[PDB]
Amino acid sequence: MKLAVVTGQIVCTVRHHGLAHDKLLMVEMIDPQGNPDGQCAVAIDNIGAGTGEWVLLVSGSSARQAHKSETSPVDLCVIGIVDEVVSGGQVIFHKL
Template sequence: MQIAKVRGTVVSTQKDPSLRGTKLLLLQLLDEEGHTLPEYEVAADSVGAGVDEWVLISRSGHAACRVQGNEDRPLDAVVVAIIDTIYLEKRQIYNKREQYR
């Protein structure tokens, strides 16, 4: 799994029929300190995440496809959680409430 920040949405009028109704998000990957990496990922949203939220994504195709409701979809990544807080070595590096103050 990987931590990422939602940067935007991806809209496609022509796509595989199994992806109809699936919200796609553009994510920027984050390192263990919460700093942005130069890598991006497009992932299906299974939790209703919004722009600027930090999320947890399941990657690597097979693991992503095992998320309930995605078994028959051609997915490499799925947003599986919206993150509330992250602690690293007894130090808080992210708190969703503090982000929106």
Template sequence: MLLGKVVGSVWATQKETGMENLKLMIVQPIDCFGNSSGQTVIAVDRIGAGVGERVIVSRGNPARMLFPQKVVPIDAIIVGIVDSLEVGEP
């Protein structure tokens, strides 16, 4: 999993089978201090995250496992919205 910040959304009227009605968000991975740490990813959002929110993203096969009844061609999914974060001294 990774920590990220939602920086935008993606609209696609034509999608692969299995992706109908899935909201897509652009997520910038961040470190625990809020600094960018990697390349942006497009993640499915089923929990209602908005632009500017910090989120938890699951990637790879665990992301697809949240759709047990169908095969979904996704690589990343937002699994949580971060309310607060506590980090100790580095």
């Protein structure tokens, strides 16, 4: 389970049918201080995550299930949309 931000989206008209019509998002991992580093990958989305919002990514089989089932052709899937993050009793990130 890792936190990251949505930096964009990929469009693949010809793609694996097991993908249905869910969106393909460009994601970038976030460091402990709430800042985008370099780790960039593509994750499937079905909860309606937009560009600029922070999310929770899952990988491996945990991703396939979190997507649709054990058939899902994915290794990285967004399982949540972060509303906010708190550290030293001080909110570092809020969804505005």
